[PDB]
Design a binder for this molecule. Sequence first.
Ligand SMILES: CC(C)C[C@H](NC(=O)/C=C/c1ccccc1)C(=O)N[C@H](C=O)C[C@@H]1CCCNC1=O
Length: 306
Amino acid sequence: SGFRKMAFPSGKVEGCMVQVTCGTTTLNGLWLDDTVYCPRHVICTAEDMLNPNYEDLLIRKSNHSFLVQAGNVQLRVIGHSMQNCLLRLKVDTSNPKTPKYKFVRIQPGQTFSVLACYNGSPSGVYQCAMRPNHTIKGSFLNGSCGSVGFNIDYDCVSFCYMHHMELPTGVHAGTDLEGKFYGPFVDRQTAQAAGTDTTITLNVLAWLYAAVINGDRWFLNRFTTTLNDFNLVAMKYNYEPLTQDHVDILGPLSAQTGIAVLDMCAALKELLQNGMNGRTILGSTILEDEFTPFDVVRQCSGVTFQ
Ligand SMILES: CC(C)C[C@H](NC(=O)/C=C/c1ccccc1)C(=O)N[C@H](C=O)C[C@@H]1CCCNC1=O
């Protein structure tokens, strides 16, 4: 029993982290096979960062403008290209610790683990949700760029995030591993603000199902709701609308608990209108939205505490 924000084991990812220096800027890179990936703003100076032209800044560099270090061992750069907001550095050694892996662009509301790294050295692991407004509420200091987010399925690492910047509100923005940003953000020190965010309705429901699987039913009720009547309540409390696709996705959790999705929505509707009355759900005094339905099935017992 119990329920925690759980990251994936980070070992397979730790063996891919390196340090990338160019000029005076240093950040982390990701070494798969004979390529190292890292944010392209590694080629900026302090004055470049306000309005960089990366194409112009890059052509002024050679292969040996870039210093790549894997632990102790220096790695020789023998090629370089810019892919969207990333640089791809070809090196002369293929990483013997390369795991099976894919590059994936995750969807809003999905979760992943972040390995926070400094100077190519892993420092910490934690779980994140891609917010609706395409930021993540991470914990990143200077030098954390090039840290990656990932999921692990069996033995395959699905890389989905690389860290580039922090917004004025203290949340974080970055790209997939093809260099396309999540959200309308650009890699410049310009005025950039997070769009307004929304609570991830699908995840709140998934976590209510977690609470039932772990043996708690106090928040349920005898009512039910139409999709549309729920969405009128979702609107008032700044929750995402529930769609029929979201109802379908909650199918298995509804089966394992015997609670119909729209029954659970009535429960949530009532929770949004009346509060929690000083009680907790799975240890929390607030409604949690950073667990997907997949998160719940992964972590919870497949047998309900009836
Ligand atoms: C987009 C790029 C041109 C540079 C990038 N810029 C930024 O992250 C923006 C920082 C900022 C702070 C306050 C107000 C407005 C902007 C950067 O330094 N990125 C760091 C990468 O190493 C990581 C930043 C550092 C700050 C502290 N936390 C973080 O995530």
